[PDB]
Amino acid sequence: SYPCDEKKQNDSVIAECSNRRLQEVPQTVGKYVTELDLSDNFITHITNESFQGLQNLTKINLNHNPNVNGLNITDGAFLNLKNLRELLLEDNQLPQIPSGLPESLTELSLIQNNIYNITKEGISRLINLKNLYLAWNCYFNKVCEKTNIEDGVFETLTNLELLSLSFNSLSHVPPKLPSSLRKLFLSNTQIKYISEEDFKGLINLTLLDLSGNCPRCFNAPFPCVPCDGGASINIDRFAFQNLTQLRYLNLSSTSLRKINAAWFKNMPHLKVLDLEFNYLVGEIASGAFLTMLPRLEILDLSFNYIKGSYPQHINISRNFSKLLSLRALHLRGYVFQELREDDFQPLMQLPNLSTINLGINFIKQIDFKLFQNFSNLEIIYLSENRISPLVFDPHSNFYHFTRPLIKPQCAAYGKALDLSLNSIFFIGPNQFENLPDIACLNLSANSNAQVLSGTEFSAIPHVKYLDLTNNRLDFDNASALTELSDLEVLDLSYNSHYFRIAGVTHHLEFIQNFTNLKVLNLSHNNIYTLTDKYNLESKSLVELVFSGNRLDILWNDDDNRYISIFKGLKNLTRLDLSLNRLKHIPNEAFLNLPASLTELHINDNMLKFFNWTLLQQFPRLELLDLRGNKLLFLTDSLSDFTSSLRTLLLSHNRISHLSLKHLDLSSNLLKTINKLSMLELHGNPFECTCDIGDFRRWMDEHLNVKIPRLVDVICASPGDQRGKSIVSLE
Amino acid sequence: RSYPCDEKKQNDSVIAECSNRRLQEVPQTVGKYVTELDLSDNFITHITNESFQGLQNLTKINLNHNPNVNGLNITDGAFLNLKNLRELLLEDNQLPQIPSGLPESLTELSLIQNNIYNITKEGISRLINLKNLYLAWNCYFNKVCEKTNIEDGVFETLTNLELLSLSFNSLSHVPPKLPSSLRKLFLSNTQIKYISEEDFKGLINLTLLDLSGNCPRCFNAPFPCVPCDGGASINIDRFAFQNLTQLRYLNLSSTSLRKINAAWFKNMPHLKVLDLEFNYLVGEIASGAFLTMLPRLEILDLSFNYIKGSYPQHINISRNFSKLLSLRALHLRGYVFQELREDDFQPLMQLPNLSTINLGINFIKQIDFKLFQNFSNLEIIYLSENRISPLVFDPHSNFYHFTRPLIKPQCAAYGKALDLSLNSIFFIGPNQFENLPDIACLNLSANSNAQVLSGTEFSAIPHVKYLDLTNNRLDFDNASALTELSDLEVLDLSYNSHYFRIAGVTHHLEFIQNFTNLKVLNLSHNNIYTLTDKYNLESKSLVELVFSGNRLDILWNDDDNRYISIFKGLKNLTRLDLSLNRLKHIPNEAFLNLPASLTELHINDNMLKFFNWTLLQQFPRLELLDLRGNKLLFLTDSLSDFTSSLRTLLLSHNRISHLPSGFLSEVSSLKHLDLSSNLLKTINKSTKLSMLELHGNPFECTCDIGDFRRWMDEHLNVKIPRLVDVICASPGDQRGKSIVSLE
Ligand SMILES: *[C@@H]1O[C@H](CO)[C@@H](O[C@@H]2O[C@H](CO)[C@@H](O[C@@H]3O[C@H](CO[C@H]4O[C@H](CO)[C@@H](O)[C@H](O)[C@@H]4O)[C@@H](O)[C@H](O[C@H]4O[C@H](CO)[C@@H](O)[C@H](O)[C@@H]4O)[C@@H]3O)[C@H](O)[C@H]2NC(C)=O)[C@H](O)[C@H]1NC(C)=O
Ligand SMILES: *[C@@H]1O[C@H](CO)[C@@H](O[C@@H]2O[C@H](CO)[C@@H](O[C@@H]3O[C@H](CO[C@H]4O[C@H](CO)[C@@H](O)[C@H](O)[C@@H]4O)[C@@H](O)[C@H](O[C@H]4O[C@H](CO)[C@@H](O)[C@H](O)[C@@H]4O)[C@@H]3O)[C@H](O)[C@H]2NC(C)=O)[C@H](O)[C@H]1NC(C)=O
Ligand SMILES: *[C@@H]1O[C@H](CO)[C@@H](O[C@@H]2O[C@H](CO)[C@@H](O[C@@H]3O[C@H](CO)[C@@H](O)[C@H](O[C@H]4O[C@H](CO)[C@@H](O)[C@H](O)[C@@H]4O)[C@@H]3O)[C@H](O)[C@H]2NC(C)=O)[C@H](O)[C@H]1NC(C)=O
Ligand SMILES: *[C@@H]1O[C@H](CO)[C@@H](O[C@@H]2O[C@H](CO)[C@@H](O[C@@H]3O[C@H](CO)[C@@H](O)[C@H](O[C@H]4O[C@H](CO)[C@@H](O)[C@H](O)[C@@H]4O)[C@@H]3O)[C@H](O)[C@H]2NC(C)=O)[C@H](O)[C@H]1NC(C)=O
Ligand SMILES: *[C@@H]1O[C@H](CO)[C@@H](O[C@@H]2O[C@H](CO)[C@@H](O)[C@H](O)[C@H]2NC(C)=O)[C@H](O)[C@H]1NC(C)=O
Ligand SMILES: *[C@@H]1O[C@H](CO)[C@@H](O[C@@H]2O[C@H](CO)[C@@H](O)[C@H](O)[C@H]2NC(C)=O)[C@H](O)[C@H]1NC(C)=O
Ligand SMILES: CSc1nnc(CCCO)n1-c1cc(C)c(C)c(C)c1
Ligand SMILES: CSc1nnc(CCCO)n1-c1cc(C)c(C)c(C)c1
Ligand SMILES: *[C@@H]1O[C@H](CO)[C@@H](O)[C@H](O)[C@H]1NC(C)=O
Ligand SMILES: *[C@@H]1O[C@H](CO)[C@@H](O)[C@H](O)[C@H]1NC(C)=O
Ligand SMILES: *[C@@H]1O[C@H](CO)[C@@H](O)[C@H](O)[C@H]1NC(C)=O
Ligand SMILES: *[C@@H]1O[C@H](CO)[C@@H](O)[C@H](O)[C@H]1NC(C)=O
Ligand SMILES: *[C@@H]1O[C@H](CO)[C@@H](O)[C@H](O)[C@H]1NC(C)=O
Numbered sequence A: 001s002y003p004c005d006e007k008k009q010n011d012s013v014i015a016e017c018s019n020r021r022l023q024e025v026p027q028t029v030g031k032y033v034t035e036l037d038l039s040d041n042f043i044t045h046i047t048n049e050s051f052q053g054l055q056n057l058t059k060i061n062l063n064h065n066p067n068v069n070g071l072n073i074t075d076g077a078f079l080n081l082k083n084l085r086e087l088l089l090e091d092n093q094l095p096q097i098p099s100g101l102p103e104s105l106t107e108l109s110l111i112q113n114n115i116y117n118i119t120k121e122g123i124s125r126l127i128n129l130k131n132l133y134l135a136w137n138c139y140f141n142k143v144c145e146k147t148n149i150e151d152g153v154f155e156t157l158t159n160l161e162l163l164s165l166s167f168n169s170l171s172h173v174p175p176k177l178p179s180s181l182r183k184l185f186l187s188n189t190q191i192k193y194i195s196e197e198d199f200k201g202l203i204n205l206t207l208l209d210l211s212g213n214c215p216r217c218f219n220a221p222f223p224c225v226p227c228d229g230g231a232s233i234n235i236d237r238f239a240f241q242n243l244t245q246l247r248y249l250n251l252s253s254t255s256l257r258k259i260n261a262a263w264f265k266n267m268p269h270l271k272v273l274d275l276e277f278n279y280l281v282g283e284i285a286s287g288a289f290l291t292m293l294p295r296l297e298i299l300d301l302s303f304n305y306i307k308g309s310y311p312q313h314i315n316i317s318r319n320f321s322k323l324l325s326l327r328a329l330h331l332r333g334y335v336f337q338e339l340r341e342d343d344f345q346p347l348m349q350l351p352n353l354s355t356i357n358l359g360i361n362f363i364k365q366i367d368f369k370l371f372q373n374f375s376n377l378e379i380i381y382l383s384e385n386r387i388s389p390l391v392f393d394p395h396s397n398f399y400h401f402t403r404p405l406i407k408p409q410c411a412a413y414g415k416a417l418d419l420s421l422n423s424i425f426f427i428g429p430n431q432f433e434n435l436p437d438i439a440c441l442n443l444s445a446n447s448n449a450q451v452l453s454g455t456e457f458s459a460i461p462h463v464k465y466l467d468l469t470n471n472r473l474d475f476d477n478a479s480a481l482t483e484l485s486d487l488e489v490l491d492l493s494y495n496s497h498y499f500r501i502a503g504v505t506h507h508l509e510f511i512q513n514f515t516n517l518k519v520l521n522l523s524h525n526n527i528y529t530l531t532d533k534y535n536l537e538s539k540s541l542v543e544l545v546f547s548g549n550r551l552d553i554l555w556n557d558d559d560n561r562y563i564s565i566f567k568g569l570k571n572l573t574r575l576d577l578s579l580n581r582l583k584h585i586p587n588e589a590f591l592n593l594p595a596s597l598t599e600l601h602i603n604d605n606m607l608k609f610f611n612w613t614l615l616q617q618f619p620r621l622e623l624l625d626l627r628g629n630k631l632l633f634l635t636d637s638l639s640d641f642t643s644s645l646r647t648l649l650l651s652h653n654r655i656s657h658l659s660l661k662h663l664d665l666s667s668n669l670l671k672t673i674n675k676l677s678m679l680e681l682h683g684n685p686f687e688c689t690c691d692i693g694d695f696r697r698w699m700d701e702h703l704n705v706k707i708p709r710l711v712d713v714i715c716a717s718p719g720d721q722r723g724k725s726i727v728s729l730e
Numbered sequence B: 001r002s003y004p005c006d007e008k009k010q011n012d013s014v015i016a017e018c019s020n021r022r023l024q025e026v027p028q029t030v031g032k033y034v035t036e037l038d039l040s041d042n043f044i045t046h047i048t049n050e051s052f053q054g055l056q057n058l059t060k061i062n063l064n065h066n067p068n069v070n071g072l073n074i075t076d077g078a079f080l081n082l083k084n085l086r087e088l089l090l091e092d093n094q095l096p097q098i099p100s101g102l103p104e105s106l107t108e109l110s111l112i113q114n115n116i117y118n119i120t121k122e123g124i125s126r127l128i129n130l131k132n133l134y135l136a137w138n139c140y141f142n143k144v145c146e147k148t149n150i151e152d153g154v155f156e157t158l159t160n161l162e163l164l165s166l167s168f169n170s171l172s173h174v175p176p177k178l179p180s181s182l183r184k185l186f187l188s189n190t191q192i193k194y195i196s197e198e199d200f201k202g203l204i205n206l207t208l209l210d211l212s213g214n215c216p217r218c219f220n221a222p223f224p225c226v227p228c229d230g231g232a233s234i235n236i237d238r239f240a241f242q243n244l245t246q247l248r249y250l251n252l253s254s255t256s257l258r259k260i261n262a263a264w265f266k267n268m269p270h271l272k273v274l275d276l277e278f279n280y281l282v283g284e285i286a287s288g289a290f291l292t293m294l295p296r297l298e299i300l301d302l303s304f305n306y307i308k309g310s311y312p313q314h315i316n317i318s319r320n321f322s323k324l325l326s327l328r329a330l331h332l333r334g335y336v337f338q339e340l341r342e343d344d345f346q347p348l349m350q351l352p353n354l355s356t357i358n359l360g361i362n363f364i365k366q367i368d369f370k371l372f373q374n375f376s377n378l379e380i381i382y383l384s385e386n387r388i389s390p391l392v393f394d395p396h397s398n399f400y401h402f403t404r405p406l407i408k409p410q411c412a413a414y415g416k417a418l419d420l421s422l423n424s425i426f427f428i429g430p431n432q433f434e435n436l437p438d439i440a441c442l443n444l445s446a447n448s449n450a451q452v453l454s455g456t457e458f459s460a461i462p463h464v465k466y467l468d469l470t471n472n473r474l475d476f477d478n479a480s481a482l483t484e485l486s487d488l489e490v491l492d493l494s495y496n497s498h499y500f501r502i503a504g505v506t507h508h509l510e511f512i513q514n515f516t517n518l519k520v521l522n523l524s525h526n527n528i529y530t531l532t533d534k535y536n537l538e539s540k541s542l543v544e545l546v547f548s549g550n551r552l553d554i555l556w557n558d559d560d561n562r563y564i565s566i567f568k569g570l571k572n573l574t575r576l577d578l579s580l581n582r583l584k585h586i587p588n589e590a591f592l593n594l595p596a597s598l599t600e601l602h603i604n605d606n607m608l609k610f611f612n613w614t615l616l617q618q619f620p621r622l623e624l625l626d627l628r629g630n631k632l633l634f635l636t637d638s639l640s641d642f643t644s645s646l647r648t649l650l651l652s653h654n655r656i657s658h659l660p661s662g663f664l665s666e667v668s669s670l671k672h673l674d675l676s677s678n679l680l681k682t683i684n685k686s687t688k689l690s691m692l693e694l695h696g697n698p699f700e701c702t703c704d705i706g707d708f709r710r711w712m713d714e715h716l717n718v719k720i721p722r723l724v725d726v727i728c729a730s731p732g733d734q735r736g737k738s739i740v741s742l743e
């Protein structure tokens, strides 16, 4: 299956031809293929011969061609393809919409080109278009002052559901838009005024994006140019009167000081409202508009701080109690010093509020008991505040940061409190007094140097997932954290002494006291020696991450004190030993790794030899990861030593000569192959020669097996073929 | 030409540096003129009386850290031959006993980091000339030495002994029968929990006593630590120090002290330096009888005396601090408190010579900054690692008192220095610097500070000369940025990025030209890839631009050639750092538009495949050219035709495989040529050259090299370092031998 890999999905067969240095549309493409991904290549010309005799094609991706003049597409180059629905032509340095596109198309993407004329003929006549993407064409870099949209070019597209013109200079919403529209994206379009007539038709509209017009252009990485003065976007009172279906409204970075409550009079289903990066401190305090949003589930009022203002208190309108459907409130970057019980009274009566996001407010103190008064809080996000011890890609939501606030696997356990990146340099006795019952707690990165003694967390004893990463904690005391008898996940990654000094010693006895600890992460603790007790012991532990410590020192111990260090983890199935500067694992030591192991990582060490013999000791082992070592040869008789192994990763080793499903030998020193569904081989210095004919034939006799990056499976020698993919030659 | 050691003249005397050379024996190829021999950090296993035969003149030997990667075997009387041996260093040698038969000539002996548990007469008594004896670290916590045994009176015979260090051994009690000659006695970490009146006896000449780390304050300690019973402090008799009238330096750090007996200092009128770090003296700081007893104290360290879990509103400073009349530096780190008021520091305001106040690591939320106006000689206000908001191992180091300058000397040289690094100044409040004295040196490093600089932020301290803004998230796009500091000479904006760590950051560097006396600017690691509106840096004054870790590759592959002249407007620039800019190729005309004034050009750690040597003609003043760590393949045949000014050319870690014949030829304005770590197999046939570095090349040790070998012997002036690492790659049997080794 070449030159592309060809694969089943659904009832459709797919050709992945992305990122392979192709200089032309191959003619070696499977005839069954209905979707062709040619993205991120070096293709320069598309003609009506490029896709000849291929009626079946339904989707083509030509994005990012070519790399490192743009893409030349003849007139009617695609017209032949009677079934073409989806055509992606992003980042192609196109100067005009290609002429003679097939009427079959339902999705067309021309983002990141140089198209300044949206002409009928170009797109008129593509009546079947549902989704049309024209964003990022007349962006500030280079020639287009304004994007010329021929009058009524879209009125003919009466099935158009999505139109994106974001990141082009338009000045005004185009007239003569089809009523069929459901999602209209007009972010960053230099539209400083919205008339009553601009959206009058669009009854079916569920999403409107006007973000970044009259931007709040403060320290924004991307070019930012506000309207004259600090002037906000101008939106007519009745601009939105006929948009009864709107669910998503984005007004981020429109320099808004006032929000007209009449905008929402006829908008009873509004679900999500983005008001990040405006100046709505006043409006938050009064807030007529808040009574008009009884179905709002998500409100983002982030980064509406006033420059230079660090008020004692936040002023929350009482009208917030009228957001009855509110599930998530995002109030980052208001910036204020104190949160009192009373300031959040309006929110205490909202029945479905499960997320309060107060990140990046530099709050010095919070009256923490106030969070007891919420019936459905699942997420309290307080990262980047100042709590003390208590005694690019177009398809990104630029204005709203998009990944989960708290790691899903932590918040899964229950109520989550994230106090990362605050001032909690030690754990005060009253640190967690008056909190609700917390299951997930983040203390990451507080320069916290607490000597854990078994009393610090007793006020929230039902924590299940505890992130303590990037602190300077001492867990020598065997009672450390034992007050959390229900703890399942503990992350102590990157924990070191305060002074970041050479030395330190560890005592890991506290581990055994937990009867339900599942995952423990000790990565990059620079553990080189254990005190008094040389064995980790746990009946419950399933995953130990030990990367970035000094097992080289521990196992070269003159007394062999640590030969059985992990053996006491009787239930362990995953072990990470990466980055331990291992040259040689004493045979004995390796045999005393838990027999229960399922996944063993010893990558990025300096292993010169591996005793393959010992694998019989691990009947359950499925994955063995030995990447990035210095290994020289493989055993001839692997089948003797394991029946279990599915995946063996050997990339970045020195192997020069040659029951399971995946073998990675990429980036080794193989000159040839003499004589299971994935074999990785790229990066080996193949001697492209006839000896190689054996292996070549083997490839043809096993098409099911996947070999990725064939294009990077390269002849090194002799000189005649060097740099040539082994497959092309005969 | 010396081998294996490098030999040099130091003062009057000749010296051999044979450190870290993988030697497996004491060489016999050592210069006869040599009086000091450094064989440290090698693979030597045996020292016999033959090791140093024919080196009578040796005065100092360093055998430290032999061997590397069981210990060093020294025969009896191995050194006895050497009549002039004064200084013998035997550190980290895994020795089990003091070598027997040491020469009586010794004045300094160091046996630190070994396994010596018996300090015997026979070992050292009768080395009557010893002045300095170091026996620290022999019976530490790790391994066998349960306790360390000192034969009675072993030191009484050493009547010239001035320094005795027994730190980091288990002793339990100060040894008896110590010579009166002692001036410095180090007993740190010796498990000595009690000090009697009799312990210091007749040590009337003593100027330094170190008792730190006995009954340690163990909390969170970086190194293994064992406190005494309960939280008990060291026990020091009232009269323990009554006859130590000369004492100048007393170290009581980490002795768990709650109370300081003022009678300890009754007879100690000259005490200069007093270390009390890591104790529990919060109470004593508030009352502090002892403070009246120290009129000549210049340095007081009361750091890290915080109480566990205590974060009091206020610090309580005794009025008795006003009796420390000679005080030059006060170190009060890690007391930990929330607020500093004017009144709290009244006692210190009247001390005439107090020039350093060190309040690092106190997590102070607010300070009444006007209070520092009331000090006549403050040169250093050190406030790192506090919580100010916006206003609207090596045994020869001090183990307890962190030793480098608090503030970079080159910053503090300009004047009063204020260090507010690692605080909470996420923006610059309008009142940030209201009420400060006149500050010349200011550190704002690492405050997550996202200020949009507009030319007003620093107007209350307008005479700042050295400004460190590193590791913040500042915007200096406004051309008025920092212009209120018209006297600014040094600006460090290293590691400045957007708050949200989102990339794509654009820059405007017009503000630079406003300063008529800006000398050094550091824009390193700002990931600058594009400039808005103005594409030229311009300055009449600037001498040094550090531009490392930006994207000149992007800037110079500009399709419009917008940045061909980017630096040309820096008319006075003499040093430019272009390292780490991912440069593959510098457009010829971009290189020509680098300032002609340049004296030092660094383009190292890029990916240069080619270098247009011809352009060096445009730089008649260029003295240093640094092209290390690139991908360069060959050298022009006649460098002399392109420069008559170049002294130093660094080409380490490049792909050069052939030396042009007639190169290194003609004009020789070249003193230093570094071709180490390249791909040279040999050097053919073909100067004021005085250093040639060649180590790390895969030399082909077959007979053709003989040319180069002979050339070495015929040019002894030319220094070639690391000859031991100038190594045959081929043919096998020669591989791994130094080429000088070949017959
Ligand atoms: C300290 O050490 C701990 C434990 O190792 C680290 O925590 C783990 O981090 C890993 C990422 O390293 C997490 O694994 C990732 O979880 C994602 C979510 O998984 C969902 O779907 C799976 C399907 O099986 C479910 O099992 C699961 O319940 C979730 O609903 C996955 O998206 C990731 O998938 C990965 O594998 C596939 C290949 O099969 C790839 O296609 C993906 O791209 C990706 O590589 C991944 O599995 C794991 O969840 C974490 N565990 C815990 C307890 O949090 C910490 O990160 C570490 N700390 C630090 C600072 O390093
Ligand atoms: C942003 O950019 C600036 C400018 O580069 C950096 O500040 C400079 O940092 C360098 C070191 O990285 C400083 O250079 C060092 O100065 C030391 C002090 O020198 C004293 O003694 C000499 C005696 O000749 C005098 O010339 C000098 O005036 C001082 O009295 C030197 O000790 C260093 O010497 C180096 O060279 C010799 C080789 O001959 C070696 O033996 C030394 O060990 C060492 O390698 C060195 O010259 C420079 O002084 C700083 N300048 C300023 C203005 O501050 C900032 O570091 C940078 N910021 C960041 C975050 O990188
Ligand atoms: C203004 O706010 C609105 C919300 O009110 C916001 O609209 C959202 O835009 C984002 C980004 O363009 C859309 O997210 C995409 O959804 C599509 C369709 O299902 C997917 O193709 C995308 O996922 C792919 O690509 C991702 C990243 O490139 C990958 O991570 C992913 O695996 C997929 O391969 C992506 O999720 C989102 O649909 C809309 N919201 C809607 C339609 O309701 C708008 O972007 C805001 N404006 C700005 C400038 O931020
Ligand atoms: C308790 O406090 C006392 C001071 O009251 C302190 O004594 C000091 O010890 C340090 C460390 O040994 C000494 O500083 C050294 O002085 C000597 C001689 O002049 C030098 O050899 C040392 O420099 C060498 O090493 C340095 C780095 O290791 C290098 O910079 C240099 O190149 C040299 O190779 C170093 O400057 C100091 O002499 C004494 N103070 C005296 C004698 O007054 C003692 O260390 C404290 N105790 C503990 C446990 O910390
Ligand atoms: C606790 O807080 C830290 C900081 O917010 C989180 O660390 C980030 O993790 C994400 C997602 O895995 C990474 O992509 C980022 O690089 C990390 N950010 C920083 C600032 O280090 C961490 O995930 C949080 N822990 C939990 C369980 O939610
Ligand atoms: C400003 O404060 C920062 C942090 O205190 C100083 O940064 C240290 O610089 C020294 C010497 O160059 C290094 O050895 C340390 O590793 C640095 N620490 C950190 C956390 O970066 C900086 O030197 C100070 N600036 C001045 C001018 O004194
Ligand atoms: C907090 S009120 C404020 N006033 N000036 C600033 C920065 C300068 C103008 O952009 N900030 C501020 C605001 C925000 C949102 C963050 C993240 C930071 C670091 C600082
Ligand atoms: C100062 S109050 C305090 N109470 N317990 C601690 C840590 C436990 C001591 O081993 N700290 C504290 C003290 C210091 C000195 C620093 C630096 C930190 C981060 C915290
Ligand atoms: C609006 O959407 C509905 C589906 O609810 C559809 O039937 C109608 O035709 C759409 N309006 C158009 C295409 O103008
Ligand atoms: C709260 O959530 C439930 C389930 O998602 C839903 O039925 C209910 O209507 C929501 N409450 C409001 C006021 O919307
Ligand atoms: C092993 O861990 C699993 C979870 O992965 C758990 O259900 C079980 O309790 C553990 N088994 C034993 C024998 O401890
Ligand atoms: C692997 O180690 C075992 C010791 O348990 C030994 O018997 C065997 O010889 C080793 N195999 C190899 C190839 O070194
Ligand atoms: C004590 O010190 C002085 C030098 O400061 C000296 O004159 C006297 O002899 C010394 N005592 C000895 C060597 O016993």
Ligand SMILES: *[C@@H]1O[C@H](CO)[C@@H](O)[C@H](O)[C@H]1NC(C)=O
Pocket: B325, B326, B352, B353
């Ligand atoms: C202050 O310093 C000067 C010069 O360094 C010195 O002469 C003077 O004695 C010192 N003052 C006191 C009170 O010791």
Ligand SMILES: *[C@@H]1O[C@H](CO)[C@@H](O)[C@H](O)[C@H]1NC(C)=O
Pocket: B540, B541, B543, B572, B574
């Ligand atoms: C440039 O700086 C140098 C110091 O390198 C100095 O000698 C010269 O006077 C300065 N010239 C100007 C014009 O500032």
Ligand SMILES: *[C@@H]1O[C@H](CO)[C@@H](O)[C@H](O)[C@H]1NC(C)=O
Pocket: B588, B612, B613, B614, B615
């Ligand atoms: C270097 O550039 C100059 C242009 O000034 C040109 O004359 C010369 O040929 C170039 N040399 C090389 C080796 O490219």
